[model samples]
Target: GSKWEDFFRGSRITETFGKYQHSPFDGKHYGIDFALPKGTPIKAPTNGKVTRIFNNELGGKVLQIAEDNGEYHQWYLHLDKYNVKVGDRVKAGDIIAYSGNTGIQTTGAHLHFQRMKGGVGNAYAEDPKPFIDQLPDGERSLYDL
Candidate 1:
């Protein structure tokens, strides 16, 4: 299986940027906002080790989980708080953080999720909506918690 397939199943990708607007750095919109509420618990989208955590400029209380498959990275941004830290191994569905409006430019609490191939500094990111949309409805339990 491809790295993407191993980590994502039946998920949908949504555009965070307007259709005509270019992404901040890449001039392309390639990620999605989960559109969740503040304090909403965020789960590990895949089984992986928490690779990085940042309380900084681009995102607040952020966490980057690297899929064990090694070629993909899942970014959870604008978090109100985090439950995991660097090096913590997490399984899919493990609550790792809470949604937030933490970035300096954000207006409200929501998760800005990005899927990237080749990890950080990669040339491109792929929209995750399609993958999310295909996920079996019951496989996702975060919404009920």
Candidate 2:
């Protein structure tokens, strides 16, 4: 499959810290926050299936999409709504959910997206910018207004 671009055009990493530092968290950033408004539509970066969904303590209305590539997992959190269910296959650029300021967040709305290999709590995760940066230019778009 072709590489994709920013989930939301003009979006950049808004916050980085903790195990997300270069020294800790496997010598790489653990997570990166995308600055977007509340209820922004979220898309699948690749063709994948919804492997899990969570409305837990740190990730309210979250959905984990396991890519067909099998090399990475896309974590979409703080959603106001989700478009698919567990085991549902989704194509690249498909609308998956609407971003929100849920979970352990304290501010305006945004999506706290992360890419984890092996899985969370497995001591393996990386900043998503490198991959997101490589995405094709014109493919980027904003969530519905």
Candidate 3:
């Protein structure tokens, strides 16, 4: 596994957030997709606690992290494997999982990263660009590297 910065450096955004002629969310993409190789280390963007770990038809092998006493919760879908379990605490840049195309609606091996306000739900979905913009050298580097 690699550091969070390194993992991001090796990845590229395949999709952006918002409306698109795609599956689910009534053609709205609530999350952004980072196209990366399978087994690429997935890292936490901030300190949080593992709140959920489960599978579903659309998002297979999913993991959610609720910010410690904060408003945002992160959702990572199509994971290869999880490094932590429910109730586990993690910090920014922690390797939480590996990228994979485990979900049914997936296009390829990539990570579907979503951030929501309060908790997990379609209505709560918020743009993760602000967070992505805050990534190290994320704004200056077009690739989010």
Candidate 4:
């Protein structure tokens, strides 16, 4: 199967991308936020290398996993703590960080997850659900490469 497992085991998405009660972030949302408590364990949704890890105004403490083949990059924002640092290669289901609410755009503690095309800071970002739904019933890894 060429898709990812659940980003967090047994966790569910509470808010979706687009306009909401809390207004918007980065002019518009480039990612989906998962409603969770602070310090919740988060795992890597797919295999990739940690390209960026730093604090920012919108995302706060963020971690980016860019696909080796340049397919897409997974972004994790507002992390309470990062388990892996920049340049670390992570596989599907690796514990990456703990959920947090460190950004100005957040209403509560949650995870802002996004998939950017053609590496980080690219023009477009998309939902992670579409790719997750494509995962086989009993698998954790996505794509053969």
Candidate 5:
């Protein structure tokens, strides 16, 4: 088997990014959530610079990563703690945050992961499920939409 793109292999997917009637969340759920234990380790998926870190009403304790090409960015939302500040150049395999249910919409502790092109505000967010699902040993889509 190949190495997983994320920190934890066989991560239990709690929910995916997409629109669904069953979703209690308003608008679209823009990120994938892994229903892991509280204080789970969160890591960088690729080499990028820490762009934004702020606590939002929706995505509390949120932070982001922008690729060197400026075409892709990854979101780390609902974090319990941050390991990097803005402008930090983080490489893949770096632990960037700790997972937590800090957001207003959160029901449990999980890592909210999102991939974006261009920037978060301008670019359409990519559904990370397909990529996360295909990662090593992570077929545990317990919460299918």
Candidate 6:
């Protein structure tokens, strides 16, 4: 096991990015899902600016951080609590928020992590696998968790 595995100790991935034919949220899964229980602390994968924090019908309590380079943004969705606020600069491994099942149609508690290029307006979803370490643990095609 590598530090990536240790980065997210006790958490396992339930869904992966790209095309995943399954129930609930089928088709192209823009983000990956980590099977985190409620209140599980989530850490920042890299240093970034906390650009936005809001609740949505689809994603529930969502938090996003834009990479310092302005080329990409990271999204943390379905959070139960936020440790940081908008405009906050966070370093890697900083506790940003806690996981939850607050989003609609959520199958279970988990963290929906997505990486997108560009900012909010002209943003485009990108697969986060290349940016973050994916656990070799077993994955399942689930809707929200």
Highest TM-score: give the candidate number: 3
Off by over 4 Å in 3: 1-11, 23-26, 104-106, 137-145
lDDT of each: 0.68, 0.69, 0.78, 0.70, 0.71, 0.75
What is the C-alpha lDDT profile of model 4 across 60-123, one tens digit per residue?
Answer: 8888788766777788878889889889998777788887788845367777778878656636
What TM-score does each of the candidates earn? 0.73, 0.74, 0.81, 0.74, 0.75, 0.78
lDDT of 4 at 52: 83
TM match of model 5 to true structure = 0.75
* Local lDDT at 45 for model 3: 77
Give the runs in model 1 whose Cα sits over 4 Å from its true position: 1-26, 104-107, 138-145
- lDDT tens string, model 2, 61-90? 778888787767877778888888998999
lDDT of 3 by residue, 16-66 (tens): 888776655568888888777778888887778998899998788999899
After superposition on all C-alphas, the RMSD of every candidate to the true structure, in Å, is 9.1, 7.3, 6.2, 7.7, 6.9, 6.9
> What is the clash count of model 6?
0
Worst 10 residues of 3 by lDDT: 136-145
Question: Count of backbone clashes for each model?
Answer: 16, 3, 0, 1, 0, 0
Candidate 2 matches the true fold with a TM-score of: 0.74
Error of 6 at 95 (Å): 0.7
Which residue window of length 10 is worst by lDDT in model 2? 136-145
* Residue 6 lDDT (model 4): 68
